[PDB]
Amino acid sequence: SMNPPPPETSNPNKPKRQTNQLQYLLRVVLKTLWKHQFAWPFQQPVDAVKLNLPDYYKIIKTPMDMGTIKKRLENNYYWNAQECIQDFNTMFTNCYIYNKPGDDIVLMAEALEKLFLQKINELPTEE
Numbered sequence: 001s002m003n004p005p006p007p008e009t010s011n012p013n014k015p016k017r018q019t020n021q022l023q024y025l026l027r028v029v030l031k032t033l034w035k036h037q038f039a040w041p042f043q044q045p046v047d048a049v050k051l052n053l054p055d056y057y058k059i060i061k062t063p064m065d066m067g068t069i070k071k072r073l074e075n076n077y078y079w080n081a082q083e084c085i086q087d088f089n090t091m092f093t094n095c096y097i098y099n100k101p102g103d104d105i106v107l108m109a110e111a112l113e114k115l116f117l118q119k120i121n122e123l124p125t126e127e
């Protein structure tokens, strides 16, 4: 059993910016979810080998995790806020796609997503 390579966190061929919205996504949104009691499973890529989930990367073709998002934000990898917001949503959706409703991992994702939605509701207007 093998894990795929993780998502890229640097790409000199990809245009990127610092924006006040992206700064908010790191300082407020990522920071808030990262410190949460249920953050730990989402702080790095899913290790499908160690977790004995050999079908994981057959079902999940767009893996994403907050470790990757954190690195991307710190590196200023993104062009806009929507790209980063999409990464968070991909992470949550992967969990709901792979697992059953009410599973502990799904409950954890739901708690993080609730806070995510609350914080992005107050995403500042672009300066």
Ligand SMILES: O=c1cc(N2CCNCC2)oc2c(-c3ccccc3)cccc12
Binding pocket: 041, 042, 046, 047, 051, 053, 094, 095, 098, 099, 105
């Ligand atoms: O979709 C998942 C599906 C699963 N599993 C399916 C249910 N049993 C635990 C692993 O785990 C996940 C984990 C995880 C990582 C380390 C320990 C525990 C969980 C993290 C993120 C997503 C999943």
